[PDB]
Amino acid sequence: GFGGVEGKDILVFTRQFATMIDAGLPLVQCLDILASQMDNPSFKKVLFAIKSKVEQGSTFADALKEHPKVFDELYVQLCAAGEVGGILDAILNRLAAYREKNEKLKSKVKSALVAIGVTAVLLLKVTPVFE
Amino acid sequence: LDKSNLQLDMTKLGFDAQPLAWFKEAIDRPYGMVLVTGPTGSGKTTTLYSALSSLNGLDTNICTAEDPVEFNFAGINQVQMHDDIGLNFAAALRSFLRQDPDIIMIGEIRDFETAEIGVKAALTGHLVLSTLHTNDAPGTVSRLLNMGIEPFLVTASLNLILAQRLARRLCPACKKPAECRDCNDRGYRGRVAIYEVMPFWDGLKELVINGASAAELKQEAIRLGMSSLRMSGLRKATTLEEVVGNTAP
Amino acid sequence: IKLVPKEVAEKHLVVPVNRAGPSLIVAMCDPSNIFAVDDLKFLTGYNIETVVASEVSIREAIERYKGPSLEDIVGDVGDDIEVTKEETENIDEMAKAADDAPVVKLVNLILMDAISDIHVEPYEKDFRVRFRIDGVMYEVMRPPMKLRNAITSRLKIMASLDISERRLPQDGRIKIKMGGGKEMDFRVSVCPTLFGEKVVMRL
Amino acid sequence: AKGKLVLGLDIGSTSIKMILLKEQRKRGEVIYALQSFGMKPLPPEAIVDGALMNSTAIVQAVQDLMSELKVKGKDVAIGVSGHSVIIKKIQMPRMSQDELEESIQWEAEQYIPFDVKDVNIDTQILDGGGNDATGQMDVLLVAAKKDMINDYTTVVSEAGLAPVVVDVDAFAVQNMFSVNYDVPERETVVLINAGASVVNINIISNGATVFTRDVTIGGNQFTEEIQKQLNVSYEEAEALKIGGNGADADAVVPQDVERVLSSVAEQVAGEIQRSLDFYAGTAADSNFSKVYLSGGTAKIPALFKTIEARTGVPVEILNPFRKIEVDNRKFDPAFVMDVAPMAAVAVGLALRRPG
Amino acid sequence: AKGKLVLGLDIGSTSIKMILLKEQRKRGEVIYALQSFGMKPLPPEAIVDGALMNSTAIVQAVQDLMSELKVKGKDVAIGVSGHSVIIKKIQMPRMSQDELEESIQWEAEQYIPFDVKDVNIDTQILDGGGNDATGQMDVLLVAAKKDMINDYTTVVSEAGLAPVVVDVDAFAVQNMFSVNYDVPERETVVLINAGASVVNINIISNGATVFTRDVTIGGNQFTEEIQKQLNVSYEEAEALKIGGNGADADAVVPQDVERVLSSVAEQVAGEIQRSLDFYAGTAADSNFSKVYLSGGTAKIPALFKTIEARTGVPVEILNPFRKIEVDNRKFDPAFVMDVAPMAAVAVGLALRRPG
């Protein structure tokens, strides 16, 4: 059993990859940079391992497959769809926008079915049940 | 441009005579360093790429630093290096000379902090080659000396300097090697000792030999080496891949 | 990797090992056998690029597809250079007893991956060298992009530095335990080296 | 019913060729004789990897063949691609036909890198009546994917043709020389068919095949080297090969071309030497005898002398059409000779069709 | 039943070779005689580390051997890889067969770095009838993994062959010279088989083996050094070895090659010297006598003179085929002599098969 990473931390890293890849850096050099700029070890550690698969010649989608607990099937398939169609840059931009919307939506239920769904049923009928 | 790189098949285009190209072929084999000078769009880069491409470079480690790709070479032992964000030309040359290049090609010297590394590479005894924007000898030398290489280091370690031109006669578009053997420096001087091997007469569109003798290009470690140069002198298919393929042999 | 039946690979001692530039890289022990080659051409429908390999190395790769290694890797007490090589080695042997319960002395590869001029210019380019007597010669050693990248980090790290897309060129020195040095130039990715990552070593 | 079918060169890759021989009457006598023949270069993309990728289009071509021919006949023998067939020897025990066919399938099973999913056919390298049950069985198996056969029957079905025999080229090319081979019954002969997709070697004692081997190298490789070294299109590099290499005025071009094709000449010579050495195992001590060439790739100028000196065997072009009567008023022997190598198979399964 | 089986060189690594001798009749007399032989380069990847990674393909090769041979026979003796077998001496006490086999297994148990998980066989270095129970037992054990044997029986089962003997090469190579060795009954002889995967030394008094030792070094190492020093493929480096090293025109190439192979020559000489010194323990005071060479790695030009001067022993090539009748009308003695070293084992377990 392994967990994913925080909504914040997926966000930062998907943004910064989308940014570097759309800059025309090589994918492996993009990977190196975000690992080397990371503050949490678990991120720098994974991203070295994702990069290690990319330097063996695997796609980014197949390299992220080593962390299925962090990048779900829907994420990889978006990457792999971008790689198959020659649009890796624009699907990473999409994924970065997705991850940003996901983190913002998380903070913002919780502040004051996942946790958001269970907490949102639970808040929507609490009062009317009291009543 | 239009490219895919011009070859020595360009004695078709009357630019350089076959004899001179053999002399350069020789020259490049024993690692005489050369700079191609010329005003803007006289053919510097093309000619350079032609001279490297025409040689068999399959047995030597060659080694190029450019601000962007322009150089195509049909050769295996070759490291191609391109300036990236925040790197000076000197970073790549400085770290490259570091390995073991038999031949170093600098796209064009424009920060002379790299120029300096280049002529340093010439004095260790590499075969260095590059391009420079200028139209004659005060043009270059001035241009080379103004970020701090001396003419003893450049002229003393630079072997040959070709000068390229565009000649127009109404609608012909002609690119010719207008002309230069750098002998060395002089103690107490004017410095740059230059022996002009070939000039180009535009009036007849001809390349003349102007006081060059066989005793000049002797510079050989010996008899057998010098003999090899002579044979290539007179003894030594348009595509680059095939041409390289046939200089290789 | 993909072949026809595993049985056919083992019988003919051949193994596909990649697909590049519309061609199937096929490692083959008997490249003079036109029957086997034409069988592979017909069964795959793919144009082949033949690479000769030692028979037992091909067989080994067929059966593996580097496992015993995939586990001995997760042993931090091995890579650690702070530990004397004399002892480190011992751990690798005893740890290898896990599979079959002996000590293997001298696993060539298991050691080869844990413990005058070399020119490594790009991806899928045969290495060149300068021999003490023969000078510039081509070599039977090539690495595709993944292997290149891995070498490249290996050499970089042993020399004490961290090459990356942020710092793509690297001019360090390896200290062989025998006090012997070597100058290493090195480049990751293709950002400065379009022909891919690359390294040179002046011993 | 007993029909005189027809013959196309369906796996020509460079060219779809077709031949009609039949019982020709002259002066109250009748013998097999050439009636027509036809040739059209194969449009690209119709065949990929030995399979018919564009059946309907190849149909259009074949029908062009038939109308060009001016032929009534709509039955055909044809051939599979050398790249589409596994040919190899097999040792078994002599028994009832059913037990041999099943046993044959069983032994082929491992030697076929596909499921069956395979069409299989054998013939015995020696006469079965000459040995008893349980002893001295030797069949050679021809094996093929359904998708290939089905592609071909597709093309044929649509040209309005009906197939009766789907033969293989390395042996169909021999039917023209089978009488002349049967003249020396103990001589070992090699037969090379250098095509555009493949080069076959079959080597025989008499007209008894001893073995066959198929080499990926062919004329396409020569054309492709010419194309590489002069960034030419395939067709123009092909013409440069043909007329470039053989004209009386070609004195300046065998340097430019030969230097282009020299690596292919070397690799072909090495692959043929290798095949010959891999055969040569019971007659330790002996040498070769004589050999013939077929296929248009053979027609490379001087290639016959090169193969002769390099393989240690006299390699000669041969005229297939000597096996059939040829009316000089409808065909002149000179050209007929000129396209004999391309057409060897094209009249091959053609004598198969009035068999 | 009493069959005359066949003989392949299954662990040739460089080459699968096969031999058929049998009772040949001439003028009402019958003796063992060569009937056929066959050789095909081992398809690579077929053998790795002395195991058949791949029964099925090797099968295809073996069947090529049999049809090339033109042989009826489907029974075979073969051999395991020198890298796949542990051969070593063992001292015990003479008793009942069962007690010896179990005792033998028990003593081998420590000397085998695998579980058993091992196929074991012994033979006695001296005649058991010459000693009483409890005294003077000496067997030598041959030991092997099941996975190897099972790989080999796989290959054999599929070629349609039936094995009766799985022998070992260091002793199978001797059966050709056993009579000639039995001529001097007190002479100490060495026999080197320099193969492509391994070099064996067995040293004897008469045709009584005294010991065997297997060295990882072989002809593969020479080829690999050539390949290293001229970044060549394995096959071309092999050809450069063969014809490069022995042609009359090779005057310029023994510098380029010999400088490449010199480290291997040194290391081979040192490993052979080492093995000989590790034997030489009871005859403190003595010298050697005479020795023979087998295996294609022996055929390195001048290697025999080098080993002769370097080891202090007359090392000579030998013709195995002298042990069998050879019809001059079917084989010429010159070549037969030429491939004698490669084929020594190939006719070795071959005299084992009409035993």
PDB file of N, CA, C and O in Angstrom, chain D residues 177-207:
ATOM      1  N   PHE D 177      13.413 -25.188 -66.840  1.00  0.00           N
ATOM      2  CA  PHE D 177      14.704 -25.818 -66.958  1.00  0.00           C
ATOM      3  C   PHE D 177      14.669 -27.285 -66.553  1.00  0.00           C
ATOM      4  O   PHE D 177      15.704 -27.944 -66.592  1.00  0.00           O
ATOM      5  N   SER D 178      13.490 -27.817 -66.200  1.00  0.00           N
ATOM      6  CA  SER D 178      13.407 -29.156 -65.614  1.00  0.00           C
ATOM      7  C   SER D 178      13.858 -30.243 -66.591  1.00  0.00           C
ATOM      8  O   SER D 178      14.492 -31.217 -66.177  1.00  0.00           O
ATOM      9  N   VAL D 179      13.511 -30.123 -67.868  1.00  0.00           N
ATOM     10  CA  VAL D 179      13.973 -31.102 -68.857  1.00  0.00           C
ATOM     11  C   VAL D 179      15.493 -31.040 -68.973  1.00  0.00           C
ATOM     12  O   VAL D 179      16.186 -32.067 -68.894  1.00  0.00           O
ATOM     13  N   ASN D 180      16.028 -29.828 -69.145  1.00  0.00           N
ATOM     14  CA  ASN D 180      17.465 -29.640 -69.329  1.00  0.00           C
ATOM     15  C   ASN D 180      18.244 -30.095 -68.098  1.00  0.00           C
ATOM     16  O   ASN D 180      19.380 -30.569 -68.229  1.00  0.00           O
ATOM     17  N   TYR D 181      17.654 -29.950 -66.909  1.00  0.00           N
ATOM     18  CA  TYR D 181      18.243 -30.473 -65.684  1.00  0.00           C
ATOM     19  C   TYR D 181      18.151 -31.988 -65.633  1.00  0.00           C
ATOM     20  O   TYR D 181      19.065 -32.660 -65.147  1.00  0.00           O
ATOM     21  N   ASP D 182      17.021 -32.543 -66.109  1.00  0.00           N
ATOM     22  CA  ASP D 182      16.854 -33.989 -66.116  1.00  0.00           C
ATOM     23  C   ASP D 182      17.819 -34.653 -67.087  1.00  0.00           C
ATOM     24  O   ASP D 182      18.025 -35.868 -67.019  1.00  0.00           O
ATOM     25  N   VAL D 183      18.416 -33.872 -67.989  1.00  0.00           N
ATOM     26  CA  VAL D 183      19.473 -34.417 -68.842  1.00  0.00           C
ATOM     27  C   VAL D 183      20.686 -34.869 -68.026  1.00  0.00           C
ATOM     28  O   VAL D 183      21.135 -36.002 -68.230  1.00  0.00           O
ATOM     29  N   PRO D 184      21.270 -34.060 -67.092  1.00  0.00           N
ATOM     30  CA  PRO D 184      22.283 -34.626 -66.184  1.00  0.00           C
ATOM     31  C   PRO D 184      21.715 -35.081 -64.842  1.00  0.00           C
ATOM     32  O   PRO D 184      21.412 -34.245 -63.988  1.00  0.00           O
ATOM     33  N   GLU D 185      21.599 -36.396 -64.618  1.00  0.00           N
ATOM     34  CA  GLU D 185      20.828 -36.857 -63.468  1.00  0.00           C
ATOM     35  C   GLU D 185      21.646 -36.884 -62.180  1.00  0.00           C
ATOM     36  O   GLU D 185      21.071 -36.945 -61.087  1.00  0.00           O
ATOM     37  N   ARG D 186      22.976 -36.815 -62.263  1.00  0.00           N
ATOM     38  CA  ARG D 186      23.802 -36.803 -61.060  1.00  0.00           C
ATOM     39  C   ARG D 186      24.600 -35.514 -60.893  1.00  0.00           C
ATOM     40  O   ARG D 186      25.430 -35.434 -59.979  1.00  0.00           O
ATOM     41  N   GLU D 187      24.344 -34.507 -61.722  1.00  0.00           N
ATOM     42  CA  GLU D 187      25.035 -33.234 -61.597  1.00  0.00           C
ATOM     43  C   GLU D 187      24.319 -32.323 -60.605  1.00  0.00           C
ATOM     44  O   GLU D 187      23.095 -32.200 -60.629  1.00  0.00           O
ATOM     45  N   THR D 188      25.108 -31.686 -59.740  1.00  0.00           N
ATOM     46  CA  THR D 188      24.599 -30.731 -58.767  1.00  0.00           C
ATOM     47  C   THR D 188      24.576 -29.341 -59.390  1.00  0.00           C
ATOM     48  O   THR D 188      25.625 -28.819 -59.796  1.00  0.00           O
ATOM     49  N   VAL D 189      23.389 -28.744 -59.473  1.00  0.00           N
ATOM     50  CA  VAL D 189      23.195 -27.457 -60.127  1.00  0.00           C
ATOM     51  C   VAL D 189      22.635 -26.468 -59.123  1.00  0.00           C
ATOM     52  O   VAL D 189      21.796 -26.820 -58.279  1.00  0.00           O
ATOM     53  N   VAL D 190      23.085 -25.218 -59.197  1.00  0.00           N
ATOM     54  CA  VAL D 190      22.444 -24.165 -58.424  1.00  0.00           C
ATOM     55  C   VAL D 190      21.600 -23.319 -59.357  1.00  0.00           C
ATOM     56  O   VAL D 190      21.918 -23.165 -60.542  1.00  0.00           O
ATOM     57  N   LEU D 191      20.507 -22.789 -58.819  1.00  0.00           N
ATOM     58  CA  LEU D 191      19.634 -21.876 -59.531  1.00  0.00           C
ATOM     59  C   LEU D 191      19.347 -20.697 -58.621  1.00  0.00           C
ATOM     60  O   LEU D 191      18.746 -20.867 -57.543  1.00  0.00           O
ATOM     61  N   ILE D 192      19.797 -19.517 -59.040  1.00  0.00           N
ATOM     62  CA  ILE D 192      19.538 -18.276 -58.325  1.00  0.00           C
ATOM     63  C   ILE D 192      18.426 -17.541 -59.058  1.00  0.00           C
ATOM     64  O   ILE D 192      18.495 -17.379 -60.286  1.00  0.00           O
ATOM     65  N   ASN D 193      17.407 -17.114 -58.337  1.00  0.00           N
ATOM     66  CA  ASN D 193      16.435 -16.153 -58.854  1.00  0.00           C
ATOM     67  C   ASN D 193      16.611 -14.883 -58.035  1.00  0.00           C
ATOM     68  O   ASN D 193      16.150 -14.798 -56.890  1.00  0.00           O
ATOM     69  N   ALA D 194      17.277 -13.904 -58.616  1.00  0.00           N
ATOM     70  CA  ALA D 194      17.462 -12.600 -57.999  1.00  0.00           C
ATOM     71  C   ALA D 194      16.293 -11.712 -58.399  1.00  0.00           C
ATOM     72  O   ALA D 194      16.236 -11.209 -59.526  1.00  0.00           O
ATOM     73  N   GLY D 195      15.344 -11.542 -57.488  1.00  0.00           N
ATOM     74  CA  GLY D 195      14.174 -10.731 -57.716  1.00  0.00           C
ATOM     75  C   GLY D 195      14.337  -9.329 -57.181  1.00  0.00           C
ATOM     76  O   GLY D 195      15.444  -8.865 -56.892  1.00  0.00           O
ATOM     77  N   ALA D 196      13.211  -8.635 -57.042  1.00  0.00           N
ATOM     78  CA  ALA D 196      13.209  -7.305 -56.456  1.00  0.00           C
ATOM     79  C   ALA D 196      12.967  -7.311 -54.952  1.00  0.00           C
ATOM     80  O   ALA D 196      13.411  -6.384 -54.263  1.00  0.00           O
ATOM     81  N   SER D 197      12.284  -8.333 -54.432  1.00  0.00           N
ATOM     82  CA  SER D 197      12.011  -8.435 -53.004  1.00  0.00           C
ATOM     83  C   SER D 197      12.868  -9.466 -52.289  1.00  0.00           C
ATOM     84  O   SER D 197      13.013  -9.387 -51.067  1.00  0.00           O
ATOM     85  N   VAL D 198      13.445 -10.419 -53.019  1.00  0.00           N
ATOM     86  CA  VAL D 198      14.089 -11.577 -52.412  1.00  0.00           C
ATOM     87  C   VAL D 198      14.973 -12.214 -53.473  1.00  0.00           C
ATOM     88  O   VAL D 198      14.741 -12.053 -54.673  1.00  0.00           O
ATOM     89  N   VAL D 199      16.006 -12.923 -53.031  1.00  0.00           N
ATOM     90  CA  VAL D 199      16.809 -13.766 -53.912  1.00  0.00           C
ATOM     91  C   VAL D 199      16.680 -15.197 -53.419  1.00  0.00           C
ATOM     92  O   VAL D 199      16.989 -15.489 -52.262  1.00  0.00           O
ATOM     93  N   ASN D 200      16.215 -16.089 -54.293  1.00  0.00           N
ATOM     94  CA  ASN D 200      16.167 -17.486 -53.898  1.00  0.00           C
ATOM     95  C   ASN D 200      17.338 -18.259 -54.486  1.00  0.00           C
ATOM     96  O   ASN D 200      17.811 -18.001 -55.596  1.00  0.00           O
ATOM     97  N   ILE D 201      17.814 -19.200 -53.689  1.00  0.00           N
ATOM     98  CA  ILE D 201      18.749 -20.230 -54.105  1.00  0.00           C
ATOM     99  C   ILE D 201      18.018 -21.549 -53.962  1.00  0.00           C
ATOM    100  O   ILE D 201      17.516 -21.868 -52.880  1.00  0.00           O
ATOM    101  N   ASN D 202      17.913 -22.297 -55.047  1.00  0.00           N
ATOM    102  CA  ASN D 202      17.605 -23.710 -54.892  1.00  0.00           C
ATOM    103  C   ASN D 202      18.699 -24.484 -55.601  1.00  0.00           C
ATOM    104  O   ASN D 202      19.130 -24.105 -56.695  1.00  0.00           O
ATOM    105  N   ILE D 203      19.175 -25.543 -54.950  1.00  0.00           N
ATOM    106  CA  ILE D 203      20.235 -26.390 -55.482  1.00  0.00           C
ATOM    107  C   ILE D 203      19.753 -27.829 -55.528  1.00  0.00           C
ATOM    108  O   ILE D 203      19.141 -28.329 -54.571  1.00  0.00           O
ATOM    109  N   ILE D 204      20.086 -28.497 -56.640  1.00  0.00           N
ATOM    110  CA  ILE D 204      19.478 -29.739 -57.088  1.00  0.00           C
ATOM    111  C   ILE D 204      20.549 -30.754 -57.477  1.00  0.00           C
ATOM    112  O   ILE D 204      21.666 -30.408 -57.842  1.00  0.00           O
ATOM    113  N   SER D 205      20.166 -32.031 -57.420  1.00  0.00           N
ATOM    114  CA  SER D 205      20.797 -33.087 -58.199  1.00  0.00           C
ATOM    115  C   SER D 205      19.788 -33.519 -59.254  1.00  0.00           C
ATOM    116  O   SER D 205      18.747 -34.098 -58.919  1.00  0.00           O
ATOM    117  N   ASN D 206      20.093 -33.232 -60.524  1.00  0.00           N
ATOM    118  CA  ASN D 206      19.170 -33.413 -61.655  1.00  0.00           C
ATOM    119  C   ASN D 206      18.096 -32.335 -61.525  1.00  0.00           C
ATOM    120  O   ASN D 206      18.436 -31.173 -61.248  1.00  0.00           O
ATOM    121  N   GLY D 207      16.826 -32.655 -61.726  1.00  0.00           N
ATOM    122  CA  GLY D 207      15.726 -31.786 -61.365  1.00  0.00           C
ATOM    123  C   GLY D 207      15.095 -32.289 -60.082  1.00  0.00           C
ATOM    124  O   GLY D 207      13.867 -32.339 -59.955  1.00  0.00           O
TER     125      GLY D 207
END
